[PDB]
Each structure stands twice: as structure tokens, then as C-alpha cells.
Design an enzyme around this catalytic site. Sequence first.
Site, PDB file in Angstrom:
ATOM      1  N   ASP A   1       0.820  -1.275   0.000  1.00 51.27           N
ATOM      2  CA  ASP A   1       0.000   0.000   0.000  1.00 51.27           C
ATOM      3  C   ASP A   1       0.835   1.299   0.000  1.00 51.27           C
ATOM      4  O   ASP A   1       0.302   2.378   0.226  1.00 51.27           O
ATOM      5  CB  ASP A   1      -1.046  -0.047   1.153  1.00 51.27           C
ATOM      6  CG  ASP A   1      -0.424  -0.184   2.517  1.00 51.27           C
ATOM      7  OD1 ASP A   1       0.769   0.160   2.705  1.00 51.27           O
ATOM      8  OD2 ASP A   1      -1.133  -0.691   3.385  1.00 51.27           O
TER       9      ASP A   1
ATOM     10  N   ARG B   1       1.071   6.702   0.297  1.00 51.90           N
ATOM     11  CA  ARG B   1       0.257   5.689   0.998  1.00 51.90           C
ATOM     12  C   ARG B   1      -1.144   5.718   0.419  1.00 51.90           C
ATOM     13  O   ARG B   1      -1.791   6.777   0.370  1.00 51.90           O
ATOM     14  CB  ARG B   1       0.225   6.009   2.479  1.00 51.90           C
ATOM     15  CG  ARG B   1      -0.629   5.090   3.332  1.00 51.90           C
ATOM     16  CD  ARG B   1      -0.157   3.629   3.374  1.00 51.90           C
ATOM     17  NE  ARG B   1      -0.801   2.836   4.447  1.00 51.90           N
ATOM     18  CZ  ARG B   1      -2.020   2.275   4.338  1.00 51.90           C
ATOM     19  NH1 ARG B   1      -2.745   2.391   3.218  1.00 51.90           N
ATOM     20  NH2 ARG B   1      -2.527   1.591   5.343  1.00 51.90           N
TER      21      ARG B   1
ATOM     22  N   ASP C   1      -5.918  -1.162   3.734  1.00 54.59           N
ATOM     23  CA  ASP C   1      -4.790  -1.705   4.456  1.00 54.59           C
ATOM     24  C   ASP C   1      -4.395  -3.039   3.873  1.00 54.59           C
ATOM     25  O   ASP C   1      -5.202  -3.936   3.770  1.00 54.59           O
ATOM     26  CB  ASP C   1      -5.123  -1.742   5.943  1.00 54.59           C
ATOM     27  CG  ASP C   1      -3.900  -2.064   6.800  1.00 54.59           C
ATOM     28  OD1 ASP C   1      -2.785  -1.677   6.456  1.00 54.59           O
ATOM     29  OD2 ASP C   1      -4.137  -2.702   7.779  1.00 54.59           O
ATOM     30  N   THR C   2      -3.166  -3.154   3.399  1.00 51.31           N
ATOM     31  CA  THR C   2      -2.617  -4.457   3.008  1.00 51.31           C
ATOM     32  C   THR C   2      -1.834  -5.055   4.162  1.00 51.31           C
ATOM     33  O   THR C   2      -1.356  -4.338   5.054  1.00 51.31           O
ATOM     34  CB  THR C   2      -1.746  -4.348   1.760  1.00 51.31           C
ATOM     35  OG1 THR C   2      -0.650  -3.441   1.992  1.00 51.31           O
ATOM     36  CG2 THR C   2      -2.542  -3.958   0.470  1.00 51.31           C
TER      37      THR C   2
ATOM     38  N   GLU D   1       1.339  -6.535   6.065  1.00 49.47           N
ATOM     39  CA  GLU D   1       2.771  -6.188   5.968  1.00 49.47           C
ATOM     40  C   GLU D   1       3.488  -7.320   5.221  1.00 49.47           C
ATOM     41  O   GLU D   1       2.990  -8.466   5.179  1.00 49.47           O
ATOM     42  CB  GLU D   1       3.385  -5.939   7.352  1.00 49.47           C
ATOM     43  CG  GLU D   1       2.768  -4.750   8.118  1.00 49.47           C
ATOM     44  CD  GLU D   1       3.008  -3.370   7.481  1.00 49.47           C
ATOM     45  OE1 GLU D   1       4.098  -3.148   6.927  1.00 49.47           O
ATOM     46  OE2 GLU D   1       2.096  -2.474   7.558  1.00 49.47           O
TER      47      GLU D   1
ATOM     48  N   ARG E   1       4.017  11.012   4.202  1.00 51.12           N
ATOM     49  CA  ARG E   1       3.578  10.255   3.041  1.00 51.12           C
ATOM     50  C   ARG E   1       2.410  10.912   2.421  1.00 51.12           C
ATOM     51  O   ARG E   1       1.487  11.321   3.120  1.00 51.12           O
ATOM     52  CB  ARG E   1       3.161   8.814   3.414  1.00 51.12           C
ATOM     53  CG  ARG E   1       4.260   8.051   4.122  1.00 51.12           C
ATOM     54  CD  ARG E   1       3.867   6.631   4.464  1.00 51.12           C
ATOM     55  NE  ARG E   1       2.697   6.580   5.335  1.00 51.12           N
ATOM     56  CZ  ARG E   1       2.193   5.446   5.852  1.00 51.12           C
ATOM     57  NH1 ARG E   1       2.737   4.247   5.621  1.00 51.12           N
ATOM     58  NH2 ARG E   1       1.098   5.512   6.552  1.00 51.12           N
TER      59      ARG E   1
HETATM   60  C1  LIG Z   1      -3.900   5.372   5.248  1.00 54.32           C
HETATM   61  C2  LIG Z   1      -3.650   6.429   6.312  1.00 54.32           C
HETATM   62  C3  LIG Z   1      -2.782   6.122   7.351  1.00 54.32           C
HETATM   63  N1  LIG Z   1      -2.455   7.025   8.268  1.00 54.32           N
HETATM   64  C4  LIG Z   1      -1.585   6.677   9.411  1.00 54.32           C
HETATM   65  C5  LIG Z   1      -2.456   6.032  10.516  1.00 54.32           C
HETATM   66  C6  LIG Z   1      -1.587   4.976  11.140  1.00 54.32           C
HETATM   67  O1  LIG Z   1      -0.826   5.547  12.251  1.00 54.32           O
HETATM   68  P1  LIG Z   1       0.095   4.629  13.175  1.00 54.32           P
HETATM   69  O2  LIG Z   1       1.417   4.467  12.512  1.00 54.32           O
HETATM   70  O3  LIG Z   1       0.135   5.517  14.322  1.00 54.32           O
HETATM   71  O4  LIG Z   1      -0.624   3.340  13.368  1.00 54.32           O
HETATM   72  C7  LIG Z   1      -0.633   4.587  10.006  1.00 54.32           C
HETATM   73  C8  LIG Z   1      -1.043   3.387   9.188  1.00 54.32           C
HETATM   74  O5  LIG Z   1      -0.221   3.265   8.032  1.00 54.32           O
HETATM   75  P2  LIG Z   1       0.396   1.843   7.642  1.00 54.32           P
HETATM   76  O6  LIG Z   1      -0.766   0.871   7.504  1.00 54.32           O
HETATM   77  O7  LIG Z   1       1.178   2.206   6.419  1.00 54.32           O
HETATM   78  O8  LIG Z   1       1.311   1.417   8.769  1.00 54.32           O
HETATM   79  O9  LIG Z   1      -0.644   5.668   9.120  1.00 54.32           O
HETATM   80  C9  LIG Z   1      -3.135   8.274   8.249  1.00 54.32           C
HETATM   81  O10 LIG Z   1      -2.909   9.095   9.183  1.00 54.32           O
HETATM   82  N2  LIG Z   1      -4.011   8.641   7.280  1.00 54.32           N
HETATM   83  C10 LIG Z   1      -4.329   7.742   6.326  1.00 54.32           C
HETATM   84  O11 LIG Z   1      -5.149   8.035   5.468  1.00 54.32           O
HETATM   85 CA   LIG Z   2      -0.162  -1.818   5.744  1.00 51.80          CA
END
Ligand SMILES: Cc1cn([C@H]2C[C@H](OP(=O)(O)O)[C@@H](COP(=O)(O)O)O2)c(=O)[nH]c1=O
Ligand SMILES: [Ca+2]
EC number: 3.1.31.1
Length: 129
Positions: A15, A29, A34-35, A37, A75
Site C-alpha cells: 500500500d 500511501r 490496508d494491506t 505487511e 507520506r
Molecule cells: C492510510 C492512512 C494512514 N495514516 C496513518 C495512521 C496509522 O498511524 P500509526 O502508525 O500511528 O498506526 C498509520 C497506518 O499506516 P500503515 O498501515 O502504512 O502502517 O498511518 C493516516 O494518518 N491517514 C491515512 O489516510
Molecule cells: Ca499496511
Amino acid sequence: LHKEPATLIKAIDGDTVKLMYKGQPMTFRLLLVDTPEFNEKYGPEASAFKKKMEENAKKIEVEFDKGQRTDKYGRGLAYIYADGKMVNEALVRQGLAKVAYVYKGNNTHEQLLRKAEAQAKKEKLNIWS
Ligand SMILES: Cc1cn([C@H]2C[C@H](OP(=O)(O)O)[C@@H](COP(=O)(O)O)O2)c(=O)[nH]c1=O
Ligand SMILES: [Ca+2]
């Protein structure tokens, strides 16, 4: 919402991807998904699917939603299209991502993706098997 150009720099995982956008390298991102890991079940299949879709594309485009364009990690948050096909939707439709991280004001394609998830689930594809 509008589509804007970008070019692939490097695949990363299911993702995230590194694109050049307005001539600067950025990690993007995918919105609303959510994919798994890479180390998790279907993580490698998600990464491969995304990688192939994006590398084989003639044209990559990014589409920001109405709200936040960059997350707390710097991102880019976007819908990404590969020759007009939404990567976010395709992953969900294949059972390789779940609909997730649906925040108010950046959720334009929520219901489109929820429909794709329902069909993946009904088919018992991949994460829904
Ligand atoms: C997809 C997305 C993720 N994020 C943040 C929330 C999550 O925070 P935390 O790192 O605190 O869990 C994290 C999830 O991304 P990943 O699934 O890439 O890890 O990225 C956003 O803030 N906005 C979004 O639209
Ligand atoms: Ca992910």
C-alpha cells in the site's frame, strides 16, 4: 477530485510506493486501504500485485481527496491509478487489502471500495479464504 501525473520511482509494498510527483520523489500511501505487511499472510501477494500493476502501467496518476494530502509520516495520501484503473480498488477487489483508515473528509471513494470488498468476501478471495 482530479487525476494528476506522476512517475514510478520504486515499488515498496502492498500500500506504499515511491513516485515522482511535481518532479519530487515522495512515498505515497494508498487512501482507504490496508494491506498485510510483507512478513504477514498475503503480504507478499499484495506487494507483488501492486508492483506489477504499477510497473506495467504506461501512465501512473495520483488523485488526492478533499482533506489531508500528507500524513504524519510525510507520506502522500492518494488514490493511485495505473492506466486509468484504481490500484486501491483492485487490491480490495482481489481480497489483497481491507477497507481501512476511513477518516472524515478524505473518504470520497469509500463506498466504491466497500462494494469491491463485499465481492471479494463473497468470492472468498485471498484474505477472505
Ligand atoms: C492510510 C492512512 C494512514 N495514516 C496513518 C495512521 C496509522 O498511524 P500509526 O502508525 O500511528 O498506526 C498509520 C497506518 O499506516 P500503515 O498501515 O502504512 O502502517 O498511518 C493516516 O494518518 N491517514 C491515512 O489516510
Ligand atoms: Ca499496511
